[PDB]
């Protein structure tokens, strides 16, 4: 189950936890010189549902985005218990929380769950990012408890797809409208053919702090940015 | 063969004893007594029987006293008889190969891993004393 | 039969089957029988013994100044729930400041040995328990079961081959509620020389009778008091 | 049956059958109750010569008249034995007097029988108990099961079947002391395999006039010799 | 597949879980319809019974579950999970009001139920409530609100809702009918929702089997419509 | 008018057992100070052959040393093989 | 026929085999029927004696739960027993916090949701038995409720649990239950229970009849049912 | 055949989670220390090197812990945080409790008994 | 007839797990020890020095107070905790009674606890079997071997680990009635009857019942080995 090691490989239930994140919804993140852009795909399943009620972007701070890719039920847990732990660390040091103790904090928790032996790990695996200090910083984390830090990274559908555009297309310098315009090159490139002001979702880090963009400003810069 | 041999036109004085290797495979048409009485098996020498082969296997060649049988014999700890034979063989192979006299550890380590395929008896165990 | 191992596990005919095999292991006890008159209550058990040489393994044991208790099956859990009554005994004994009605004993008794016939991690008692008391409406002859499902009577037999004993009930249970002591203690062992193969007798050593009485104190007696019970007999009809 | 909280469909007792069955391998030993003392005898089954006779236990000293003998497992006897003593001091602590030995067993097997994991195995020891009590001397014998009887001569363990035999065939009801020792030692050296001869067996005597030093040490070389 | 026989709450290969997909239709097991629909300041309910016996009530057979003065829901499914998920519904919704002094939102209340739902399912060795419920409630700065709480714990909400046994078909009318752009006067709502129940099961029955519920801004309270004016309503669309 | 008793046996306790000791032994050179019921004791569960084995062993003891009368000392030897070193192999030692 | 073990597990088709199975446990129970009137709520069980070993008034599976309110239980009886103690420890927190008497509702509420409590987890099983719940009032009338097995309850005007529970509810409902008295109610449980199953697999059964309403002033009681006699003498000239 | 869990032996009898604890050390990160007097090095094997990564941690294998000492690592990467910060912990207090650094056998034989006590326990 | 665990019976009445974990034992290092009247003598074999570390980290041989010697066999890990535990419980007795903590103690708290962790539910038997020698009370010699199942068992001279019946065989052989000389010459003939007998992985300690422990030079012992040596030609 998850008490005990295969005669050689690995650990199957994570894997098959990895698995169900790589079956999610897809999405994209890019750390560019000033800033940081999260973007998400959310398609509703019919023409019925609101798209003012569920919110994939999602502030943990003023001043850090964090998003993901897997199951929103899941989601909302471990942000929640995000929360009370930056305010934790505000309460304890009267400073808004680093994004790696956060992200060391955050694998902690999950990797408590990953531990044995009757819990199931998250089917979900984030994208942290925040502007500590000046210069601002992506993390992704995993089910397994691990993390990583990322210049341009994606999660989900095709992936490995986006993330060869990624290669080819990204750079190490640009500002946060290219990228911008390169984040929804690379979700357009594995979405539908529809993309409109709400089937994405996007929020941006700037140095003056996190900031979520609006339906408004999404269906100005979306209306065919290229 | 079972009603001539320990069957009609019995034993009387008749020695037809039938060893084996294994145990398992067989009718239990003999093995209840009668047809086959007593049974014996084979471990694989000690190390007093370990120097024992060695001496009589080493022998053949001029010894490189300076090899530590002893090493051989308790990291080959289950050496059946075959490796003993084969080992020094190709012990002396190995040496005359560049005909020498003396056999250094070397080719004792060469030979005996030749024939000592697929050998691993570290941990387990492995991870004690 | 993959399913009949454990007490939480409904049958697919709906019969936990530990429950019948704690009533088969209740089945293997001595024979021992309980009846009453109208104003006094007589049970009468059988003692074995491991070899000739021992003593013989008792039964009657005393619990309180008007409750005593007959048992067949395990021990251990005949002395648990011996510990339990006592406890419960004493308990309202010190608040009340009177003698238990023999009802909510038992009820307590039965309301004990639910936990463990439904949740895992205890197996349900092998018990034998006959209950003779007195509260204020005179004597009562209970019973329990491993499934906890105590019953009332006014005759019962339980232990092996007690069922000649229960055809003995069967037809002297009218004749049982007018007389005293001394023919009822015979009725119960002209049970129980019925209880036992016909090629021996019923000796001193081997029986045990525990009268309470409506001014009488529960007592247990054994070969002395119970050598003028064994006379007053004769031969089975051979 | 895998297991000590399941029954059987017949009346088997499993967890305490098998124990049942774990005693028989065990050392033997035999006491015999005589009104004039309660008299003990065990083998030790010596295997080396560094094996150091007096330090294996099989009779022990509970009190300043209650003796003991074990069997089959040696570690649930070191238990039972070590809280047997401790509950006889307290009895002595609230009562300044000795608990007799029908109380001792009792007070034994009131956890004797009592395994729980949950909510811690049944044990594994035949337990011979002999005391001097206000009634004279007493024989005891108890089992796993806690299922406690007195018994006048018991012997357990290892061919018990035979020494049962052959103990109802000399034993009755007015034997003597020394009679009953010799003809234990005559049951024992039927009984055992190797020669009989001062470091095999030990006895064990306790009586009402001689309720102190429940042992003979090497005067049991005398007794043997006189066989 | 299985294979692992999806006894407990694993991850399988490929790469779902089969428990909480096996509890989306112990809703299949009521035999039992919802609908809910907001077009405008107003929110409607419509839910049948299925009583066969004389014997047997009517009152007491009330799926609409009033849990606050402004909040009402329904409820389908088994019937144990659904009342157990009611009374924590109310506990809960208490508790916001003890705590912080004032009426709670409707998407709180979703939120708290999805959550007990989730740790229902996060941690083993508890059945995951095979139950579904629909909320509605008015909110100030935001209207009517419909809303749907799933068994797994995802809750969403939406202009024209449905959960129960033939729902599909009723998404496939609501989706053939919430196209047009036209307002929803109310009677618009009440009848659109009667006869996409009524083209749903194609039954156009009396007016004593289904249950209307309703909330409107001009009486913010949760409100139970009476046979009088059911009926009034059911042949106020009889052309 | 076919089969109509239907007996039944199986192993012996040890009455039997011992009966069988003696009978092979009678059957044979042995020793007649020697007892059985503390041989029926070592033996656990056997067949008659199995103990006639066990006869065997003794004798092949007396062929090794010059034995007449078989000994309980030659069927110690004889023991200790067919229930310790014959109960399957050797496997019970080095814990008492 | 392929995983029915725990009772925290679900099916390959979506139910749990260890409710049913316990549902299907009462059905082999005795036959117990309720039916309320205008002004009160009558029980009824058919009770069997084994066969000679009885006493006729032990093991009453007739309850008496609060002042009002009492059980029909039917199934295994201890589980009865302790669901009763239950029972009583509610009414007797809700008498102790409230000062007044249990509405029947809140009463079941909390039940219904005990035995759902106790078909949840894997660690227990679901209860074996089947019980009716009546009560009366003055401000309320009568009230009949009913607890399966599962944990569901709601209420009826007449109900069956045991083997002929459609047999007693085909001849239940053409009873004229509104306009009648309990005291006609009474003879009418004699005979309903008296058509089924008089000698056919066993061989004899016992009557008891529990008795609630406003004849009693709110008090809940079995009837004197040796006063007026009201089964045999009917129960002789129903079999024709 | 008598793999179920952690506990217990096998039969012959060697263990089963603690050989395959060792083939999950084999597939990992390669380090080594040397002999040297008047100091001491590491060596360790960056795993994945791919190019979109930051590098701004300055330690991916090498644990500075208290101060005068550092560990490399290999295996299954998160248990060694849950390791490595209790190790901190374990010599912090230590030097919390005596006001001198530790001596480093006493934190060595600390951090086997925190392994040990997840050999023995089951499960 | 099953498997698992510790807790059930044999279908004939063993504990396959005690006589299994007792194998642990069986295949180990050897390590022997003898009483002599005044001076108490034992030590181990296999050094199995690899060529390039330490080894005073890796000795098998300890105390527990001044006046008691340890040894063991099977694996490490469980003598390291026993022995952890049984300092913290010779100082607790120390706590208590005055006294120097007698041998018969020690080896009660050790064979109770080995025990009662065998009982328990679920816990590994320490695969362990020590050897617990000293002198107390009027420096009176005694040695005591343990076992897996927890059986305190008083010899005279004992042999443990690998091929441990041909050295006690060779302990039956020499053990005579009939002095610090004796004992000294009586390891030295132990260490040459040792499995391997190789000369330098001989790791011997002594105590002489009023010292504390003596770790040994391999150059004596060098000597030991010449004058068996030259006893062994004085032989023909
Ligand atoms: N009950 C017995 N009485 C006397 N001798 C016996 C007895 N049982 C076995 N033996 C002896 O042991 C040997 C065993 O032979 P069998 O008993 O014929 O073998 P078997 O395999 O049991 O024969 P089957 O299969 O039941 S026909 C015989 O040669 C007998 O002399």
Same mark, same amino acid.
């Given at each position: 189950?998850?008490?005990?090691?295969?005669?050689?490989?690995?650990?199957?239930?994570?894997?098959?936890?990895?698995?169900?994140?790589?079956?999610?919804?897809?999405?994209?993140?890019?750390?560019?010189?000033?800033?940081?852009?999260?973007?998400?795909?959310?398609?509703?399943?019919?023409?019925?549902?609101?798209?003012?009620?569920?919110?994939?972007?999602?502030?943990?701070?003023?001043?850090?985005?964090?998003?993901?890719?897997?199951?929103?039920?899941?989601?909302?847990?471990?942000?929640?218990?995000?929360?009370?732990?930056?305010?934790?660390?505000?309460?304890?040091?009267?400073?808004?929380?680093?994004?790696?103790?956060?992200?060391?904090?955050?694998?902690?928790?999950?990797?408590?769950?990953?531990?044995?032996?009757?819990?199931?790990?998250?089917?979900?695996?984030?994208?942290?990012?925040?502007?500590?200090?000046?210069?601002?910083?992506?993390?992704?984390?995993?089910?397994?408890?691990?993390?990583?830090?990322?210049?341009?990274?994606?999660?989900?559908?095709?992936?490995?797809?986006?993330?060869?555009?990624?290669?080819?297309?990204?750079?190490?310098?640009?500002?946060?409208?290219?990228?911008?315009?390169?984040?929804?090159?690379?979700?357009?490139?594995?979405?539908?053919?529809?993309?409109?002001?709400?089937?994405?979702?996007?929020?941006?880090?700037?140095?003056?702090?996190?900031?979520?963009?609006?339906?408004?400003?999404?269906?100005?810069?979306?209306?065919?940015?290229? | 063969?079972?009603?001539?041999?320990?069957?009609?036109?019995?034993?009387?004085?008749?020695?037809?004893?039938?060893?084996?290797?294994?145990?398992?495979?067989?009718?239990?048409?003999?093995?209840?007594?009668?047809?086959?009485?007593?049974?014996?098996?084979?471990?694989?020498?000690?190390?007093?029987?370990?120097?024992?082969?060695?001496?009589?296997?080493?022998?053949?060649?001029?010894?490189?006293?300076?090899?530590?049988?002893?090493?051989?014999?308790?990291?080959?700890?289950?050496?059946?008889?075959?490796?003993?034979?084969?080992?020094?063989?190709?012990?002396?192979?190995?040496?005359?190969?560049?005909?020498?006299?003396?056999?250094?550890?070397?080719?004792?380590?060469?030979?005996?891993?030749?024939?000592?395929?697929?050998?691993?008896?570290?941990?387990?165990?492995?991870?004690?004393? | 039969?993959?399913?009949?191992?454990?007490?939480?596990?409904?049958?697919?005919?709906?019969?936990?089957?530990?429950?019948?095999?704690?009533?088969?292991?209740?089945?293997?006890?001595?024979?021992?029988?309980?009846?009453?008159?109208?104003?006094?209550?007589?049970?009468?058990?059988?003692?074995?013994?491991?070899?000739?040489?021992?003593?013989?393994?008792?039964?009657?044991?005393?619990?309180?100044?008007?409750?005593?208790?007959?048992?067949?099956?395990?021990?251990?859990?005949?002395?648990?729930?011996?510990?339990?009554?006592?406890?419960?005994?004493?308990?309202?004994?010190?608040?009340?400041?009177?003698?238990?009605?023999?009802?909510?004993?038992?009820?307590?008794?039965?309301?004990?040995?639910?936990?463990?016939?439904?949740?895992?991690?205890?197996?349900?008692? &092998?018990?034998?328990?006959?209950?003779?008391?007195?509260?204020?409406? &005179?004597?009562?002859?209970?019973?329990?079961?491993?499934?906890?499902?105590?019953?009332?009577?006014?005759?019962?037999?339980?232990?092996?081959?007690?069922?000649?004993?229960?055809?003995?009930?069967?037809?002297?249970?009218?004749?049982?509620?007018?007389?005293?002591?001394?023919?009822?203690?015979?009725?119960?062992?002209?049970?129980?020389?019925?209880?036992?193969?016909?090629?021996?007798?019923?000796?001193?050593?081997?029986?045990?009778?525990?009268?309470?009485?409506?001014?009488?104190?529960?007592?247990?007696?054994?070969?002395?008091?119970?050598?003028?019970?064994?006379?007053?007999?004769?031969?089975?009809?051979? | 049956?895998?297991?000590?909280?399941?029954?059987?469909?017949?009346?088997?007792?499993?967890?305490?059958?098998?124990?049942?069955?774990?005693?028989?391998?065990?050392?033997?030993?035999?006491?015999?109750?005589?009104?004039?003392?309660?008299?003990?005898?065990?083998?030790?089954?010596?295997?080396?010569?560094?094996?150091?006779?007096?330090?294996?236990?099989?009779?022990?000293?509970?009190?300043?008249?209650?003796?003991?003998?074990?069997?089959?497992?040696?570690?649930?006897?070191?238990?039972?034995?070590?809280?047997?003593?401790?509950?006889?001091?307290?009895?002595?602590?609230?009562?300044?007097?000795?608990?007799?030995?029908?109380?001792?067993?009792?007070?034994?097997?009131?956890?004797?029988?009592?395994?729980?994991?949950?909510?811690?195995?049944?044990?594994?020891?035949?337990?011979?108990?002999?005391?001097?009590?206000?009634?004279?001397?007493?024989?005891?014998?108890?089992?796993?099961?806690?299922?406690?009887?007195?018994?006048?001569?018991?012997?357990?363990?290892?061919?018990?079947?035979?020494?049962?035999?052959?103990?109802?065939?000399?034993?009755?009801?007015?034997?003597?002391?020394?009679?009953?020792?010799?003809?234990?030692?005559?049951?024992?050296?039927?009984?055992?395999?190797?020669?009989?001869?001062?470091?095999?067996?030990?006895?064990?005597?306790?009586?009402?006039?001689?309720?102190?030093?429940?042992?003979?040490?090497?005067?049991?070389?005398?007794?043997?010799?006189?066989? | 597949?299985?294979?692992? =026989?999806?006894?407990?709450?694993?991850?399988?290969?490929?790469?779902?879980?089969?428990?909480?997909?096996?509890?989306?239709?112990?809703?299949?097991?009521?035999?039992?319809?919802?609908?809910?629909?907001?077009?405008?300041?107003?929110?409607?309910?419509?839910?049948?019974?299925?009583?066969?016996?004389?014997?047997?009530?009517?009152?007491?057979?009330?799926?609409?579950?009033?849990?606050?003065?402004?909040?009402?829901?329904?409820?389908?499914?088994?019937?144990?999970?659904?009342?157990?998920? $009611?009374?924590?519904?109310?506990?809960?919704?208490?508790?916001?009001?003890?705590?912080?002094?004032?009426?709670?939102?409707? =998407?709180?209340?979703?939120?708290?139920?999805?959550?007990?739902?989730? $740790?229902?399912?996060?941690?083993?060795?508890?059945?995951?409530?095979?139950?579904?419920?629909?909320?509605?409630?008015?909110?100030?700065?935001?209207?009517?609100?419909?809303?749907?709480?799933?068994?797994?714990?995802?809750?969403?909400?939406?202009?024209?809702?449905?959960?129960?046994?033939?729902?599909?078909?009723?998404?496939?009318?609501?989706?053939?009918?919430?196209?047009?752009?036209?307002?929803?006067?109310?009677?618009?709502?009440?009848?659109?929702?009667?006869?996409?129940?009524?083209?749903?099961?194609?039954?156009?029955?009396?007016?004593?089997?289904?249950? $209307?519920?309703?909330?409107?801004?001009?009486?913010?309270?949760?409100?139970?419509?009476?046979?009088?004016?059911?009926?009034?309503?059911?042949?106020?669309?009889?052309? | 008018?076919?089969?109509?008793?239907?007996?039944?046996?199986?192993?012996?306790?040890?009455?039997?057992?011992?009966?069988?000791?003696?009978?092979?032994?009678?059957?044979?050179?042995?020793?007649?100070?020697?007892?059985?019921?503390?041989?029926?004791?070592?033996?656990?569960?056997?067949?008659?052959?199995?103990?006639?084995?066990?006869?065997?062993?003794?004798?092949?003891?007396?062929?090794?040393?010059?034995?007449?009368?078989?000994?309980?000392?030659?069927?110690?030897?004889?023991?200790?093989?067919?229930?310790?070193?014959?109960?399957?192999?050797?496997?019970?030692?080095?814990?008492? | 026929?392929?995983?029915?073990?725990?009772?925290?597990?679900?099916?390959?088709?979506?139910?749990?085999?260890?409710?049913?199975?316990?549902?299907?446990?009462?059905?082999?129970?005795?036959?117990?029927?309720?039916?309320?009137?205008?002004?009160?709520?009558?029980?009824?069980?058919?009770?069997?004696?084994?066969?000679?070993?009885?006493?006729?008034?032990?093991?009453?599976?007739?309850?008496?739960?609060?002042?009002?309110?009492?059980?029909?239980?039917?199934?295994?009886?201890?589980?009865?027993?302790?669901?009763?103690?239950?029972?009583?420890?509610?009414?007797?927190?809700?008498?102790?916090?409230?000062?007044?008497?249990?509405?029947?509702?809140?009463?079941?509420?909390?039940?219904?949701?005990?035995?759902?409590?106790?078909?949840?987890?894997?660690?227990?099983?679901?209860?074996?038995?089947?019980?009716?719940?009546?009560?009366?009032?003055?401000?309320?009338?009568?009230?009949?409720?009913?607890?399966?097995?599962?944990?569901?309850?709601?209420?009826?005007?007449?109900?069956?649990?045991?083997?002929?529970?459609?047999?007693?509810?085909?001849?239940?409902?053409?009873?004229?239950?509104?306009?009648?008295?309990?005291?006609?109610?009474?003879?009418?449980?004699?005979?309903?229970?008296?058509?089924?199953?008089?000698?056919?697999?066993?061989?004899?059964?016992?009557?008891?009849?529990?008795?609630?309403?406003?004849?009693?002033?709110?008090?809940?009681?079995?009837?004197?049912?040796?006063?007026?006699?009201?089964?045999?003498?009917?129960?002789?000239?129903?079999?024709? | 055949?008598?793999?179920?869990?952690?506990?217990?032996?096998?039969? +012959?009898?060697?263990?089963?989670?603690?050989?395959?604890?060792?083939?999950?050390?084999?597939?990992?990160?390669?380090?080594?220390?040397?002999?040297?007097?008047?100091?001491?090095?590491?060596?360790?094997?960056?795993?994945?090197?791919?190019?979109?990564?930051? +590098?701004?941690?300055?330690?991916?294998?090498?644990?500075?812990?208290?101060?005068?000492?550092?560990?490399?690592?290999?295996?299954?990467?998160?248990?060694?945080?849950?390791?490595?910060? +209790?190790?901190?912990?374990?010599?912090?207090?230590?030097?919390?409790?005596?006001?001198?650094?530790?001596?480093? +056998?006493?934190?060595?034989?600390?951090?086997?008994?925190?392994?040990?006590?997840?050999?023995?326990?089951?499960? | 007839?099953?498997? *698992?665990?510790?807790?059930?019976?044999?279908?004939?009445?063993?504990?396959?797990?005690?006589?299994?974990?007792?194998?642990?034992?069986?295949?180990?290092?050897?390590?022997?020890?003898?009483?002599?009247?005044? @001076?108490?003598?034992?030590?181990?074999?296999?050094?199995?020095?690899?060529?390039?570390?330490?080894? *005073? !980290?890796?000795?098998? @041989?300890?105390?527990?107070?001044?006046?008691?010697?340890?040894?063991?066999?099977?694996? !490490?890990?469980?003598? *390291?905790?026993?022995?952890?535990?049984?300092?913290?419980?010779?100082?607790?007795?120390?706590? !208590?009674?005055?006294?120097?903590?007698?041998?018969?103690?020690?080896?009660?708290?050790?064979?109770?606890?080995?025990?009662?962790?065998?009982?328990?539910?679920?816990?590994?038997?320490?695969?362990?079997?020590?050897? @617990?020698?000293?002198?107390?009370?009027?420096?009176?010699?005694?040695?005591?071997?343990?076992?897996?199942?927890?059986?305190?068992?008083?010899?005279?001279?004992?042999?443990?680990?690998?091929?441990?019946?041909?050295?006690?065989?060779?302990?039956?052989?020499?053990?005579?009635?009939?002095?610090?000389?004796?004992?000294?010459?009586?390891?030295?003939?132990?260490?040459?009857?040792?499995?391997?007998?190789?000369?330098?992985?001989?790791?011997?300690?002594?105590?002489?019942?009023?010292?504390?422990?003596?770790?040994?030079?391999?150059?004596?012992?060098?000597?030991?080995?010449?004058?068996?040596?030259?006893?062994?030609?004085?032989?023909?």
């Amino acid at each position: 189950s998850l008490t005990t090691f295969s005669p050689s490989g690995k650990l199957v239930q994570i894997e098959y936890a990895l698995a169900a994140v790589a079956g999610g919804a897809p999405s994209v993140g890019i750390k560019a010189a000033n800033g940081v852009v999260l973007a998400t795909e959310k398609k509703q399943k019919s023409i019925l549902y609101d798209e003012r009620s569920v919110h994939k972007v999602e502030p943990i701070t003023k001043h850090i985005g964090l998003v993901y890719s897997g199951m929103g039920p899941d989601y909302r847990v471990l942000v929640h218990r995000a929360r009370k732990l930056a305010q934790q660390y505000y309460l304890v040091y009267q400073e808004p929380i680093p994004t790696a103790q956060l992200v060391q904090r955050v694998a902690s928790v999950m990797q408590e769950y990953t531990q044995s032996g009757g819990v199931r790990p998250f089917g979900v695996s984030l994208l942290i990012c925040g502007w500590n200090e000046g210069r601002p910083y992506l993390f992704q984390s995993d089910p397994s408890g691990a993390y990583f830090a990322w210049k341009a990274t994606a999660m989900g559908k095709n992936y490995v797809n986006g993330k060869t555009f990624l290669e080819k297309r990204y750079n190490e310098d640009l500002e946060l409208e290219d990228a911008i315009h390169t984040a929804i090159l690379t979700l357009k490139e594995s979405f539908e053919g529809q993309m409109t002001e709400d089937n994405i979702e996007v929020g941006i880090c700037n140095e003056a702090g996190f900031r979520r963009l609006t339906p408004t400003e999404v269906k100005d810069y979306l209306a065919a940015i290229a | 063969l079972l009603n001539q041999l320990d069957g009609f036109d019995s034993r009387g004085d008749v020695k037809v004893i039938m060893a084996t290797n294994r145990i398992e495979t067989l009718d239990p048409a003999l093995i209840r007594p009668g047809r086959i009485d007593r049974k014996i098996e084979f471990p694989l020498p000690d190390e007093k029987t370990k120097k024992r082969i060695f001496q009589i296997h080493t022998s053949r060649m001029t010894l490189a006293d300076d090899v530590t049988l002893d090493d051989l014999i308790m990291a080959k700890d289950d050496l059946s008889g075959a490796d003993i034979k084969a080992i020094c063989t190709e012990a002396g192979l190995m040496a005359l190969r560049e005909r020498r006299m003396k056999v250094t550890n070397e080719d004792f380590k060469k030979s005996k891993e030749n024939v000592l395929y697929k050998k691993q008896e570290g941990t387990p165990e492995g991870l004690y004393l | 039969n993959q399913y009949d191992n454990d007490v939480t596990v409904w049958s697919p005919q709906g019969r936990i089957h530990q429950i019948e095999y704690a009533m088969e292991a209740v089945k293997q006890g001595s024979a021992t029988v309980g009846l009453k008159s109208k104003t006094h209550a007589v049970l009468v058990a059988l003692k074995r013994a491991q070899s000739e040489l021992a003593a013989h393994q008792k039964k009657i044991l005393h619990v309180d100044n008007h409750i005593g208790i007959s048992i067949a099956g395990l021990t251990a859990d005949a002395r648990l729930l011996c510990n339990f009554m006592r406890q419960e005994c004493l308990d309202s004994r010190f608040v009340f400041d009177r003698p238990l009605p023999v009802s909510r004993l038992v009820s307590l008794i039965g309301s004990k040995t639910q936990i463990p016939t439904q949740r895992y991690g205890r197996r349900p008692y &092998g018990v034998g328990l006959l209950i003779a008391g007195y509260d204020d409406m &005179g004597p009562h002859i209970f019973q329990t079961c491993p499934s906890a499902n105590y019953f009332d009577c006014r005759a019962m037999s339980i232990g092996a081959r007690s069922q000649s004993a229960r055809t003995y009930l069967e037809r002297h249970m009218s004749e049982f509620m007018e007389c005293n002591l001394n023919e009822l203690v015979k009725h119960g062992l002209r049970a129980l020389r019925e209880t036992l193969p016909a090629e021996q007798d019923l000796t001193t050593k081997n029986v045990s009778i525990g009268i309470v009485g409506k001014d009488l104190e529960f007592t247990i007696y054994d070969d002395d008091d119970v050598s003028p019970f064994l006379e007053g007999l004769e031969e089975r009809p051979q | 049956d895998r297991g000590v909280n399941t029954f059987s469909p017949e009346g088997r007792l499993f967890q305490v059958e098998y124990a049942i069955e774990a005693i028989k391998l065990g050392s033997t030993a035999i006491g015999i109750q005589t009104s004039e003392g309660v008299c003990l005898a065990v083998e030790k089954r010596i295997t080396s010569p560094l094996m150091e006779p007096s330090s294996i236990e099989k009779i022990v000293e509970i009190d300043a008249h209650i003796g003991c003998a074990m069997s089959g497992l040696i570690a649930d006897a070191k238990t039972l034995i070590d809280k047997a003593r401790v509950e006889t001091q307290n009895h002595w602590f609230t009562y300044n007097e000795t608990m007799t030995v029908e109380s001792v067993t009792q007070a034994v097997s009131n956890l004797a029988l009592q395994f729980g994991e949950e909510d811690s195995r049944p044990f594994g020891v035949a337990l011979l108990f002999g005391g001097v009590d206000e009634k004279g001397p007493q024989l005891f014998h108890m089992d796993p099961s806690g299922t406690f009887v007195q018994c006048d001569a018991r012997a357990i363990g290892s061919a018990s079947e035979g020494a049962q035999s052959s103990l109802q065939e000399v034993y009755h009801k007015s034997m003597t002391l020394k009679e009953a020792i010799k003809s234990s030692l005559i049951i024992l050296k039927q009984v055992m395999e190797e020669k009989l001869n001062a470091t095999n067996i030990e006895l064990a005597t306790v009586q009402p006039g001689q309720n102190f030093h429940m042992f003979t040490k090497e005067e049991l070389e005398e007794v043997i010799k006189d066989i | 597949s299985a294979g692992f =026989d999806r006894h407990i709450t694993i991850f399988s290969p490929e790469g779902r879980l089969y428990q909480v997909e096996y509890a989306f239709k112990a809703i299949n097991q009521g035999g039992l319809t919802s609908v809910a629909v907001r077009g405008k300041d107003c929110a409607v309910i419509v839910t049948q019974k299925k009583v066969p016996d004389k014997l047997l009530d009517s009152s007491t057979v009330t799926h609409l579950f009033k849990i606050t003065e402004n909040i009402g829901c329904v409820m389908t499914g088994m019937t144990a999970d659904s009342r157990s998920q $009611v009374q924590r519904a109310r506990y809960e919704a208490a508790n916001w009001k003890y705590k912080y002094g004032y009426e709670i939102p409707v =998407d709180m209340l979703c939120k708290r139920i999805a959550d007990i739902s989730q $740790v229902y399912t996060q941690n083993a060795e508890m059945r995951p409530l095979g139950c579904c419920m629909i909320l509605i409630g008015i909110d100030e700065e935001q209207g009517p609100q419909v809303y749907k709480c799933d068994p797994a714990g995802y809750y969403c909400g939406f202009k024209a809702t449905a959960a129960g046994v033939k729902q599909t078909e009723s998404t496939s009318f609501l989706e053939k009918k919430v196209k047009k752009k036209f307002d929803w006067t109310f009677e618009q709502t009440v009848e659109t929702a009667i006869t996409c129940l009524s083209t749903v099961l194609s039954i156009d029955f009396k007016p004593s089997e289904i249950e $209307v519920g309703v909330v409107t801004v001009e009486n913010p309270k949760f409100r139970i419509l009476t046979e009088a004016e059911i009926d009034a309503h059911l042949v106020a669309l009889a052309e | 008018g076919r089969l109509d008793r239907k007996i039944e046996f199986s192993l012996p306790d040890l009455e039997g057992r011992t009966h069988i000791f003696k009978i092979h032994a009678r059957s044979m050179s042995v020793e007649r100070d020697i007892r059985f019921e503390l041989l029926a004791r070592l033996c656990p569960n056997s067949t008659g052959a199995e103990i006639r084995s066990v006869c065997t062993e003794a004798g092949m003891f007396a062929i090794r040393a010059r034995r007449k009368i078989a000994t309980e000392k030659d069927f110690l030897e004889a023991v200790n093989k067919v229930i310790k070193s014959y109960a399957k192999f050797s496997a019970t030692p080095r814990y008492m | 026929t392929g995983y029915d073990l725990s009772a925290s597990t679900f099916s390959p088709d979506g139910r749990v085999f260890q409710v049913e199975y316990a549902m299907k446990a009462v059905e082999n129970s005795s036959t117990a029927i309720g039916i309320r009137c205008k002004d009160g709520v009558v029980f009824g069980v058919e009770k069997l004696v084994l066969s000679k070993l009885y006493e006729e008034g032990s093991n009453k599976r007739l309850f008496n739960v609060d002042r009002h309110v009492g059980m029909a239980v039917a199934g295994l009886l201890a589980d009865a027993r302790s669901l009763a103690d239950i029972a009583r420890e509610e009414a007797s927190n809700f008498r102790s916090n409230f000062g007044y008497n249990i509405p029947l509702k809140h009463l079941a509420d909390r039940v219904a949701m005990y035995v759902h409590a106790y078909t949840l987890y894997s660690a227990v099983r679901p209860f074996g038995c089947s019980f009716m719940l009546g009560s009366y009032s003055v401000n309320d009338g009568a009230q009949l409720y009913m607890i399966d097995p599962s944990g569901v309850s709601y209420g009826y005007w007449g109900c069956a649990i045991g083997k002929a529970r459609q047999a007693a509810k085909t001849e239940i409902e053409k009873l004229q239950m509104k306009e009648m008295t309990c005291r006609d109610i009474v003879k009418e449980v004699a005979k309903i229970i008296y058509i089924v199953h008089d000698e056919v697999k066993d061989k004899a059964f016992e009557l008891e009849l529990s008795w609630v309403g406003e004849l009693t002033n709110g008090r809940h009681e079995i009837v004197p049912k040796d006063i007026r006699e009201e089964a045999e003498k009917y129960a002789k000239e129903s079999l024709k | 055949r008598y793999d179920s869990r952690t506990t217990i032996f096998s039969p +012959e009898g060697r263990l089963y989670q603690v050989e395959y604890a060792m083939e999950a050390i084999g597939h990992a990160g390669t380090c080594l220390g040397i002999l040297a007097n008047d100091g001491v090095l590491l060596a360790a094997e960056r795993r994945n090197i791919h190019k979109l990564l930051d +590098e701004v941690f300055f330690s991916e294998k090498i644990y500075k812990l208290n101060e005068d000492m550092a560990c490399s690592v290999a295996g299954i990467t998160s248990d060694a945080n849950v390791l490595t910060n +209790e190790l901190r912990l374990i010599a912090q207090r230590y030097l919390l409790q005596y006001q001198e650094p530790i001596p480093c +056998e006493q934190l060595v034989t600390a951090l086997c008994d925190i392994k040990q006590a997840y050999t023995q326990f089951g499960g | 007839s099953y498997d *698992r665990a510790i807790t059930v019976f044999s279908p004939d009445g063993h504990l396959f797990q005690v006589e299994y974990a007792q194998e642990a034992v069986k295949k180990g290092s050897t390590a022997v020890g003898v009483r002599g009247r005044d @001076i108490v003598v034992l030590g181990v074999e296999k050094k199995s020095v690899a060529k390039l570390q330490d080894e *005073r !980290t890796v000795r098998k @041989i300890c105390a527990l107070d001044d006046n008691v010697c340890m040894a063991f066999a099977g694996l !490490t890990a469980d003598a *390291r905790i026993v022995i952890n535990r049984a300092r913290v419980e010779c100082q607790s007795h120390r706590l !208590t009674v005055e006294d120097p903590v007698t041998v018969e103690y020690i080896t009660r708290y050790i064979a109770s606890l080995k025990q009662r962790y065998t009982q328990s539910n679920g816990r590994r038997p320490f695969g362990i079997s020590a050897l @617990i020698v000293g002198f107390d009370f009027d420096g009176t010699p005694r040695l005591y071997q343990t076992d897996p199942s927890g059986t305190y068992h008083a010899w005279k001279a004992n042999a443990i680990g690998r091929g441990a019946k041909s050295v006690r065989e060779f302990l039956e052989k020499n053990y005579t009635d009939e002095t610090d000389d004796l004992t000294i010459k009586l390891v030295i003939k132990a260490l040459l009857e040792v499995v391997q007998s190789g000369g330098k992985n001989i790791e011997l300690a002594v105590m002489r019942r009023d010292q504390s422990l003596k770790i040994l030079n391999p150059e004596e012992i060098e000597k030991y080995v010449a004058e068996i040596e030259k006893e062994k030609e004085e032989n023909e």
